[PDB]
Design an enzyme around this catalytic site. Sequence first.
Site, mmCIF file in Angstrom:
data_model
loop_
_atom_site.group_PDB
_atom_site.id
_atom_site.type_symbol
_atom_site.label_atom_id
_atom_site.label_comp_id
_atom_site.label_asym_id
_atom_site.label_seq_id
_atom_site.Cartn_x
_atom_site.Cartn_y
_atom_site.Cartn_z
ATOM 1 N N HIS A 86 -76.241 13.640 -96.046
ATOM 2 C CA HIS A 86 -75.153 14.477 -95.850
ATOM 3 C C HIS A 86 -74.167 14.933 -96.936
ATOM 4 C CE1 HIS A 86 -72.634 11.994 -93.416
ATOM 5 N NE2 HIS A 86 -71.743 12.653 -94.167
ATOM 6 N N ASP A 122 -80.479 10.086 -92.340
ATOM 7 C CA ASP A 122 -79.079 10.248 -92.890
ATOM 8 C C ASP A 122 -78.933 9.377 -94.339
ATOM 9 O OD1 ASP A 122 -76.948 11.435 -94.001
ATOM 10 O OD2 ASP A 122 -75.659 11.102 -92.271
ATOM 11 N N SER A 132 -68.296 8.501 -94.945
ATOM 12 C CA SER A 132 -69.708 8.743 -95.196
ATOM 13 C C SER A 132 -70.326 8.126 -96.231
ATOM 14 C CB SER A 132 -69.891 10.418 -95.610
ATOM 15 O OG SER A 132 -69.429 11.268 -94.309
#
Lengths: 226, 61
Positions: free
Chosen positions: A45, A89, A182
């Site tokens: 992402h 991811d 992230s």
Amino acid sequence: IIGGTECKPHSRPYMAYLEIVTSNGPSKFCGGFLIRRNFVLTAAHCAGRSITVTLGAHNITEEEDTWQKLEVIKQFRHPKYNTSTLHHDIMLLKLKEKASLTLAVGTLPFPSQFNFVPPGRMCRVAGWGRTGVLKPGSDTLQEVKLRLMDPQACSHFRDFDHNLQLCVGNPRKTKSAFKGDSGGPLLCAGVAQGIVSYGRSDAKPPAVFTRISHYRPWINQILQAN
Amino acid sequence: LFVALYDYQADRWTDLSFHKGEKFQILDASPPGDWWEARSLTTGETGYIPSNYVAPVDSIQ
Ligand SMILES: [Zn+2]
């Protein structure tokens, strides 16, 4: 990073700060880690138009002679990555040149043997992400120690898969990865076993990390080939 | 350019919250899944939004 501590400066020299330029307006920011001199592993992402990686940083607001800034030339987003589930991811980024090895800039290569990490281990994650729901990102690299939970503690998350994902952070504590972390690594006994993926908007742990062991074939594939 | 048809409160920290009428620029819709990565023209923040909550600005009255 919520509830963490400031890292000893340059003590995690594989840590990558990513600026992802999408178009004419504020960028997005992610973490990641240097696994080979010209490869950074991060979350799917964090993909975008162009990515600048900053290596060798501690305080990211103050340029330092340890810094190496490198353009990304190729993005390998996992082909099965899906935004409803956020499964797979995970993304590899090939850098324009190989980083130079210095005190402040070093790789974190995987051990030969991957293994499946069960619940109960205490692992450490680092990042420049927000330090609270209403807080800005941290200027300095932070880290926090987090418990791997039984996957039942993450059953409130959509299609959470114990085989694909770690369930990270004791719900009875505030300690957690958060927005901006992230793509950062979760190290268990010094070995990257997770990648920060997502969690609750309200920051209540546990959060979800990509289980690196499941992807060891795919990662090895892309590197042994690029 | 896209417009929010309804209000939405995010449950995942990768996702944006927004109110009916807020405008977006879409950054990525390539992966499978009900969500597109977008940037709010109100706030300048980037995140996932549900693709079914928005419509092209010229596709509303
Ligand atoms: Zn320094």
